[PDB]
Design a protein around this ligand. Structure first.
Ligand code: PAL
Ligand code: PAL
Ligand code: PAL
Lengths: 307, 307, 307
């Protein structure tokens, strides 16, 4: 059943699906420690097709595949591929799908993963499509939260920053729909969460409050998920200069924060999280990075139908 | 011996008496948990005569009586009684005392409880007389302190706010006379503790320092008992506007406070304690409210001669 | 081998020597607790020759000698000795050395201890020579650090204040040469550590960074060793007025400090460490004073050849 499934939008997953990925992720995590080399993916090839920059998503996926015993092909720069000669996206996928058993694609255009999944008879995983979705990030974010707070429900989660272009929070907000939590969306009014998404989450009954001042909600938050201003998604630099550096987390802001407050960030960060926060017990973004491998290993194995 | 005793001024109690009430209070507290319904007061009626507003003192006393198995009569508004037709206080008590086995009275005039106790052959408990005394508050405050710090002596207690009109701190300061503690009275010079009381406490040998700046003493305090400015006791509003909002406890003030510092407040609070303090480990005012029932249950049982 | 050795410069000790003193110091410490009176120094006399003021170094040494079972002679003020008649230092030592079995000298001129050790056939211990060295302070500082952090290496130590005239940090920096630590020298540019010393420490491979702003390094420090501005060493008061009160440690500065950060100070302190820091878990300067006796007891016993 998991074999052949795509991972395009977090909205295509139920609470059971997410739960399964996270439980399976823990499985492979421990399993790795024991064997130090798994073989579920022996004879399988993962093609990582990145049309925009990535450090974590590409490297953790390729890392996961090797830990699973598979092989990896792909490109990190579209300029080196034949898209350079003018080839289209659907032609690229139709050709590359014949070389691998699973595709992971990051593209600057929203809906690129859906288009790829449509014309591929190989499972397609969305590593980020424009400012739309980022399903595997959400899945590793939820893994981290459950791992850190031991449990899902009963949490007050705050999403800060560029909620408008941040594909990470678009998916993360949608996934939280299956959990009993109070969501707080803190951001400049120019970078608010897509109305439709905030609408839907309340169309299902979730306490969602949109605010501009962080200190208003800081004190009751269990989770503070910080984001980066997606400079590369703005219409032009002027549109970005108008919201530049207009939020940041540091020791001062953390004065009115609960002792158990945990701060996350999909990364990379520019300056929205002062490095002084790093040494604090609050910071968990680098532990967040770590969980990406077992979560991505679970996804690869599941979708390749090897576990 | 306890049967028939009144509870007018905390000065009418020895260290033994206070200790007994607190030990007995713990007894009934645990006992309640077990039986979930006691009967010491079966066939006894408590008359709560409140001539001014109350939430905690009236409700906790009535609550205590029911937990003890007794019945309750009384009025929360004098306007609904025959004092409306012009009846005096002593006539009110002489008549009502024939209907109950114990009276709890809160009146806006100092000495009202003494006058009531004088003309009643039923035990009379002072729930607050003007800006004079508040014995059961002090008794539940001491219960809370011993309960929180495990013990009485060796503490540095700071009383902040309206020490002039605050009947709660007038009694609380007097009771502390039996304990080895350093008292700090922080308040505007217009709202200082009644000279006589501060005099007496030092006439017995207690280190009592009166200051205007809280931060001067904040760092060495074990207990910080905050009070509300008694607006309704001032000569007129102008007299109150001159000391309005001139003290408050929040996270900033708590920067220079000991980790074990515990903050109390007889309540209600207007703005003298910022709600951000609520989530902190320092706040114990709502735990303070809780202890009022077993303390008041102990007092009712003792004075009714049923334990 | 230890018998007859002098203690002039911390540079005359190897890592083995320092380690031995500290282990031996722990020995005598526990031993004292048991017997409550030792006799290693029975029949031995310590002469404390102080030509400048001292509270800790003189008193802890005399204290140590008595705990060891020895006797003490000496002067705290040179004005009362025959140096008053014009006697020289070498004549003073040559004469006094005939009366005791060990000398402890504090003098305002750099090299005074070396001169004393040269013309004495009795062990000479430098309790401070001008702004040059202070070996027993360093030895008790290292004892405190190992005692507090359980271990030596892997620490980030910050030395703040008057590093120019502070004989305490001149020796302390030199001793740290044998340990794997990152040293941070924070001080006004007018009070920087003697170039030669900072040079040498890096000539051996130690990460040594000299800065003016404390907050730059505060966050990563394990140890913060504060010093006093050596007013009495300045050319004149004007030279001292130019660097007066230009550093201090208080709760504000400690906002960006690690929870395990430990603050030390050889003492006395004027105002460079706000007394509010005292109650904090960071302060250990008075525990630092305590360790001086067993460290000095170890030194006396070792050098007198009685252990
Ligand atoms: O780039 C961001 O700000 C968040 C997010 N980041 C990641 O997925 C991590 P990376 O770009 O290193 O793979 C994304 O949307 O690509
Ligand atoms: O009203 C105050 O500020 C303190 C004190 N408060 C109480 O006893 C609680 P309550 O008025 O709710 O019974 C009082 O003097 O009545
Ligand atoms: O005086 C100082 O600031 C540090 C140091 N202090 C001590 O040794 C302690 P004392 O002067 O009390 O013996 C010194 O150099 O003499």
């Amino acid at each position: 059943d998991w074999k052949g499934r795509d991972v395009i939008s977090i909205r295509d997953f139920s609470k059971e699906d997410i739960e399964t990925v996270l439980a399976t992720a823990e499985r492979l995590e421990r399993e790795l420690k024991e064997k130090g080399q798994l073989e579920y993916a022996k004879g399988k090839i993962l093609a990582t097709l990145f049309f925009e920059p990535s450090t974590r998503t590409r490297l953790s996926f390729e890392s996961a595949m090797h830990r699973l015993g598979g092989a990896v092909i792909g490109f990190a720069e579209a300029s080196t591929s034949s898209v350079k000669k003018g080839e289209s996206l659907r032609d690229t996928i139709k050709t590359v799908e014949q070389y691998c058993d699973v595709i992971v694609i990051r593209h600057p255009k929203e809906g690129a993963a859906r288009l790829a999944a449509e014309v591929a008879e190989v499972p397609v995983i969305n590593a980020g499509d424009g400012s739309n979705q980022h399903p595997t990030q959400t899945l590793l974010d939820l893994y981290t939260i459950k791992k850190e707070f031991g449990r899902i429900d009963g949490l007050k989660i705050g999403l800060l920053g560029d909620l408008k272009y941040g594909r990470t929070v678009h998916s993360l907000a949608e996934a939280l729909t299956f959990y009993d939590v109070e969501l707080y969306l803190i951001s400049p009014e120019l970078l608010r969460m897509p109305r439709h998404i905030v609408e839907e989450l309340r169309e299902k009954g979730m306490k969602v409050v949109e605010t501009t001042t962080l200190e208003d909600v800081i004190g009751k938050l269990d989770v503070l998920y910080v984001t980066r201003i997606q400079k590369e998604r703005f219409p032009d630099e002027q549109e970005y200069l108008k919201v530049k550096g207009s939020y940041q987390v540091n020791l001062k802001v953390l004065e009115k924060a609960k002792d158990e407050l945990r701060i996350m960030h999909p990364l990379p960060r520019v300056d929205e999280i002062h490095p002084e926060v790093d040494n604090t017990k609050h910071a968990i973004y680098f532990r967040q990075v770590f969980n990406g491998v077992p979560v991505r290993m679970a996804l690869l194995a599941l979708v390749l139908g090897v576990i």
